[PDB]
Amino acid sequence: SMNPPPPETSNPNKPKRQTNQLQYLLRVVLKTLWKHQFAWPFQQPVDAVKLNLPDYYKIIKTPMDMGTIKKRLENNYYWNAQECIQDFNTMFTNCYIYNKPGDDIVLMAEALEKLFLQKINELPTEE
Numbered sequence: 001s002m003n004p005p006p007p008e009t010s011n012p013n014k015p016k017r018q019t020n021q022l023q024y025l026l027r028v029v030l031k032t033l034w035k036h037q038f039a040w041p042f043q044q045p046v047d048a049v050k051l052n053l054p055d056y057y058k059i060i061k062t063p064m065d066m067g068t069i070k071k072r073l074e075n076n077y078y079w080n081a082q083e084c085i086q087d088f089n090t091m092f093t094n095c096y097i098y099n100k101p102g103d104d105i106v107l108m109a110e111a112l113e114k115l116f117l118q119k120i121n122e123l124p125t126e127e
């Protein structure tokens with residue numbers, strides 16, 4: 001079984017803007033997780049072909065990863081901070097759906113999610 005196409009990161013019909021909240025999401029939130037010791041399983045879509053995980057996309061129907069989130073921010077794909085936060089939440093949820101307590105990746109996700117929450121709770125004020 002093939003990988004699905006990765007999530008879209010551009011759209012010519014979608015309006016675009018820069019905001020302080022989006023700056024914070026890319027340059028503080030994403031950056032903090034991206035450089036973390038545990039980032040590497042989350043830096044790109046799960047390649048179920050190279051990893052030989054044919055059941056991954058049978059279970060995970062809304063895939064998301066930090067490489068996609070990064071590209072979305074860098075391409076100005078998000079208008080609202082809420083959209084970006086939703087994608088981070090989806091990434092973590094998928095990890096907890098597919099993997100079990102005691103799996104190394106679950107403790108990696110929990111550490112990253114704790115840092116995500118600490119950073120998102122300091123999101124700057126809206127315009």
Ligand SMILES: COc1ccc(S(=O)(=O)N2CC3(COC3)C2)cc1NC(=O)c1[nH]c(C)c2c1CCCCC2=O
Nearest residue numbers: 040041042043046047050051053056094095098099105
């Ligand atoms: C053995 O699992 C790897 C081994 C080496 C590397 S890797 O980063 O060295 N690498 C990318 C390639 C080129 O095609 C594979 C080599 C990643 C992984 N698994 C990941 O990322 C992962 N991320 C999530 C979010 C997952 C996984 C796979 C484990 C279970 C499913 C899952 O929830």
